Amino acid sequence: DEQHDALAQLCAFRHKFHSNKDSLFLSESAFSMQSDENSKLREVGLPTIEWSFYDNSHIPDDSFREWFNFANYSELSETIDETYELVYDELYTEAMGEYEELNQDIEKYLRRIDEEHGTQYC
Amino acid sequence: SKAMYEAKERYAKKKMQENTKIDTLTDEQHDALAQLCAFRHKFHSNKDSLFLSESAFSMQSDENSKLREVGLPTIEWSFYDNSHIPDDSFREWFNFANYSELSETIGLELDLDDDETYELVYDELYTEAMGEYEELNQDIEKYLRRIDEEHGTQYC
Amino acid sequence: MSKLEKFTNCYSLSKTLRFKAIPVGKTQENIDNKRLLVEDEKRAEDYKGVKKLLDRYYLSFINDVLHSIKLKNLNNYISLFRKKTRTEKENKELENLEINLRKEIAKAFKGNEGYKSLFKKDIIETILPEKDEIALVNSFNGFTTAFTGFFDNRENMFSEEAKSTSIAFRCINENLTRYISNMDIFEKVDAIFDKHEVQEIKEKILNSDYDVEDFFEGEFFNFVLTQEGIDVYNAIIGGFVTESGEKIKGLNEYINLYNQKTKQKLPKFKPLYKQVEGYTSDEEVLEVFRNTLNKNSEIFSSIKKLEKLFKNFDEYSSAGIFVKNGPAISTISKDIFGEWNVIRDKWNAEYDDIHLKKKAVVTEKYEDDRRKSFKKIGSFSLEQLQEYADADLSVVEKLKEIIIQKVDEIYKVYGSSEKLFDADFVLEKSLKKNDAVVAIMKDLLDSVKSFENYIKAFFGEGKETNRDESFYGDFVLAYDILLKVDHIYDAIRNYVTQKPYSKDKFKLYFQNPQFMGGWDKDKETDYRATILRYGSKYYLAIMDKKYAKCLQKIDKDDVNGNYEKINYKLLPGPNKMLPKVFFSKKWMAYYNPSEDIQKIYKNGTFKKGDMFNLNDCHKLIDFFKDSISRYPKWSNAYDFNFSETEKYKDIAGFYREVEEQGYKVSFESASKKEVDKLVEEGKLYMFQIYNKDFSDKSHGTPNLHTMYFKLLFDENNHGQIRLSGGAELFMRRASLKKEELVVHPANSPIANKNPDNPKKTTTLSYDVYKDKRFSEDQYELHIPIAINKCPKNIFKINTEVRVLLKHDDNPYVIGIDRGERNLLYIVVVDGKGNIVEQYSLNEIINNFNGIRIKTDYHSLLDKKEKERFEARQNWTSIENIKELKAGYISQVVHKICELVEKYDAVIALEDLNSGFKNSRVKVEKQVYQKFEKMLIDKLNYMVDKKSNPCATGGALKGYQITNKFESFKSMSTQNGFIFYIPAWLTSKIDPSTGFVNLLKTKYTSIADSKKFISSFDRIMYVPEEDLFEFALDYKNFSRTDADYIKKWKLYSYGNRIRIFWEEVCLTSAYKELFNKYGINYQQGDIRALLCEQSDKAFYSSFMALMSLMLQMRNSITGRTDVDFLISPVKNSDGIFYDSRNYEAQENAILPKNADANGAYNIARKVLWAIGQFKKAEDEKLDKVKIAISNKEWLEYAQTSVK
RNA sequence: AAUUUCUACUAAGUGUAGAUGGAAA
Ligand SMILES: [Mg+2]
Ligand SMILES: [Mg+2]
């Protein structure tokens, strides 16, 4: 079939995601997962993606009024911008570290489908 | 005269917080030293009101008593007798040499009812009082410099 | 007799009041006619100018005589130091030679053309005249002594004590140790010597002296000693211009040319020390800020040097670039590693692989020693950070790209702020009302300041091994310039946060340098100041020096117009006034005295030291007694009634007796019409002591200071508040003008702002201007008193509170703990553990006449922090919030004081140094230290104003239950009635039994989670209660050497918070996960089934539910409604504690919510300290430890309830 | 929104309730 359509659609989705992953961290940036991609991928008949997680609801973006359990935050408050930055810094790095673990799963899917059928996607 | 006021006090406050670990000798001599240092910082703050008769104020044997108890070396003061710093016995003395000066000009004799010779002895006793108290104060700064450059702490 | 009947009259004090002073009658126009303000306005302003003139002459003196000294021991110091040393007390001879050299330049100064008339009186008189400055230095012709705060320090400039600001220490131990260093480093510039560059121009246009090797050979140190020689030396280093466009080269540039072969590795010649900010107007501060941070400023060039330094950083070794241990070390480690605790963890493992045994469990004492050994180290090497780092982590790239990110961030904020350093810049609004300009300046200053704080840790306090001196030599040479930004930060910040008004004042002297020192009758014609009462409008009297006896010849008037008048007889300092008078050449010629008495005082056996003899000093006591009887002033004016001669075991006792008695103020009358006619003649000046309580409308309680000052002239004033001397007077200026005050008009309904007033709007009949007090001028007056001058119940308070608390049998305890919900939460605990009274301190009751109108501060705080949010978080909002917190911790102290009196207690208080607490109370940490200060200040002298003055607890017999504050560490572990207690494990603790979680259940791997889930005892499920009962011992877990029970039967029910903000069921969530994974979970233990699965997400969504079974604190963080503390372990009655179960009672027996629980645990720790106070002798009470450990505390809080 | 001074006030109408230790670099 014409699985190239689904693959190029996925590839451009990758090229938006990896383009500005950082504005996904903002509360209300112009943006808008895995079950939808697997739904649009099962319909054409590919193998699925084998993601790292499906639940997605713990990537911290701007609930800066809506959490506490971080030992690292306690360590930051252990010794007297300033602190604010440590809390903002740690959640930003945790968000980026979550999203690239997402992104590597799509690149792994494309490498598997690349070196099985001899096409080119990266 | 507010920014530098807070700055010079929080610098020194950070040093008094910081030097509570450097000693690492027998005991908590930092308490006696900071108590002495704040005593210095009152003394040198208003030495001048010690000259007044009844200012809000109130030596060396007491400091050596509170210093021997913790086990420091003592201070090696300049004097212990203390009873000749002139403050407001302006009715209770005469022997000074500068009557030769005051008689070189007109002035008057040794009777202080004249309003001109009054300040002309008040100046000299004020300067002698300040000159006594800074000779006191230098002894405390010498003690702190000796204890500073023997054990590597910071006090001035 | 309760626990406060002891603690009064324990030690001295010295408050000082501050009332206003309005002149009465024609006194103000009399002052303006006799022109007594212009003189002291000059005597304030001209002082820095005359200081400038005397500093000019002093520096001319130094540069004068330094052209006449050639040091002789200099060769013998230089060669003997640069000799390779190998001392064996030869460095001691070096230091002897150094102090002798300082003595040589000291002797040069001593004989330097007099110099004895350099700090005496005639320096303002004689030498300094020989322009229009003759009146300037002649403005102080009858007034010399105000220079004595200058003549001491400028004398100490000429000492030899190796002090900092002095000449001698500089020119011998900084200049010479730079000079001989450059002398040795001259050996490493001889390979680049091109005479066309180093000799053909420098020697011809600088000195025409002997050549460049003379400055490195050591026999023009005596020529370079002057500042002209330092000028020539720094010209040969840097390069003179000689007012021509050549920009002639220097030795720094000639050594900079050597790294053309990309290898410098030769240190340059360090420049020599020579020998000796805004805050007014908007155009000036903008220009100086432009001067200090434009695109060619010195600080900005320092950033450019630093960024190129860290660009070419890789050439230096990684063995010397020491990173500073401490606060910033964790932040620096976190950026490269990606984890804050990675550096601490690697050092932890590196230490425990040596000192830990072949087991793995720890003790808390070994942990505290571990933390002490980690804080033992001074700094870390970059090589050790590469050692910590695993593969693909090169710090020489990682830190370089971080710092270039920061420098490019400063360049981007320059790209933001580039409209500010332009020549055609405009100020459209003043900085008080403008926002964009000042926030731009704020972003610039904070960005460069953050850059400095990031760079800061590359010092290592060194003091090191072979550190990279070729790197540090330019690093500090840029960092000294980067540290100058604090002079701009603490200029701009305190410029913008200052008030529109201004509190500058000058001391008023009234033509006399000897002014109001005392209040002694028979010295009042000298001091020239007295105080008159009449009804209650008090008065201050100033007599002019032309007519300095206008109060002596006054009759006791009988036409009933009178001012009562003080007399104020004070014997000053009787331990060292009596030998000053009774041996002073006129008393020795009026009394005889006896020969043995003169000898016994001259040898001085009345003092201590074992020469102390009772029946020998008793004759001296009798001599003092009889002579004071014979003295005319002191036989009459006091009522001296001593003990007998055998009733003084110490002359210190007799001195205390005469110091106790020798003070009496009475009132002999005077006229009124003759006094007011006299002040109409102008021979008197008369001011009324006044504040907002001497008015005739004050229908309430006064200020406490006016209560003291009205109590200074009572017949109750024996017990004892002595009006001292040292009084001053001051004068302000009209900071504001009258017109531009925003004035509320009369007869209009004016607004309100406290929302809990039933009178939601009011109106007045007259005006109420904004800040009327700075419209005119006002005479501030100060009148310093000395409360409890003679102390009686004298003892060590820190031991007396303990020996009181042991013998006590039901000692109350207050606790005070910060909380997220409430900034301060009070809990009062009995001697058992029952919570007597628990309440918040967000609402402030003002219990005046009958009308308990409350006011909130919590709403005020959040309503001002929203303005902080919407106003880009600028300095005015910050300092407004800091002052609002300061007012709040003022008004707490009345509640704490009254609570201490009402319950007879000892305050507990959260220690700070131990910390280890989130402390999310929405208040700054510093504000708590200020609360410490403004609590121990007030509990130095506790008094409540509504009480009667004579009765105990009043303004005469106040409570003293603390010591004075000493220093920010010496406030620890006891202070009188304030105890300091570490705040560890005080908020997250079940109050019923004492279960605390200690389980690190942040998910790491199934490799850890399988063992962690097998370590539990019995995970089952009860169907007749629908609970997921867990079970465990604690001894099979790491970090667990503190609990005592270790048999914790957990459960599940009660509401919990899940991010999803959302609400989830603890036991329904467990059931839905176990029905997601298809279990017959009703035959526990089910760990055998749970150790079979192999997908990650099951265990990742199980760890996040274990943690929610353990999370006791619940904050919805958007509303104050549900902040509920729930504990998943139940007590003997089978019910586990819920906060909302205990909120809806009147007086609970357990804490209401989280902050109250945080208070109640602190109270419990002090109760344990009291329990150990009850279990020692009175000979170890000064040594009984209070620092209760985590193990001890958890043991007590579990076995208290049973 | 008035103050010896500071904070929160308008508190019965030129103030209320608490606090406040000043000069000096
Ligand atoms: Mg009042
Ligand atoms: Mg106000």
Please tell me about this protein's structure.
It is classed as unknown function/rna. Keywords: Unknown Function-RNA complex. The assembly is tetrameric. The complex is a heterotrimer, with two copies of chain A and one copy of chain C (1202 residues). Chain A has 122 residues and is mostly helical. In chain A, 55% of the residues lie in helices and 0% in strands. With 1202 residues, chain C is of the alpha+beta class. Chain C folds into six domains: 20-36 and 510-568 and 669-783, no CATH class; 38-261, no CATH class; 282-325 and 378-496; 569-664, no CATH class; 791-988 and 1161-1199, no CATH class; 1006-1111, no CATH class. Helices cover 39% and strands 8% of the residues of chain C. Chain C has an eight-stranded antiparallel sheet. In chain C, α35 (875-903) packs across α36 (925-936). The two termini of chain C are 34 Å apart. Chains in contact: A-C, B-C. At the B-C interface, α1, α2 and α5 of B face α24 and α26 of C. Bound molecules: magnesium ion (2 copies). One magnesium ion (MG) binds at residues 700-702 of chain C. The structure holds one RNA strand of 25 nucleotides.
Short description:
Chain C: This is Cpf1. Chain A has helices at residues 3-17, 34-42, 71-78, 83-117. With 122 residues, chain A is mainly alpha-helical.
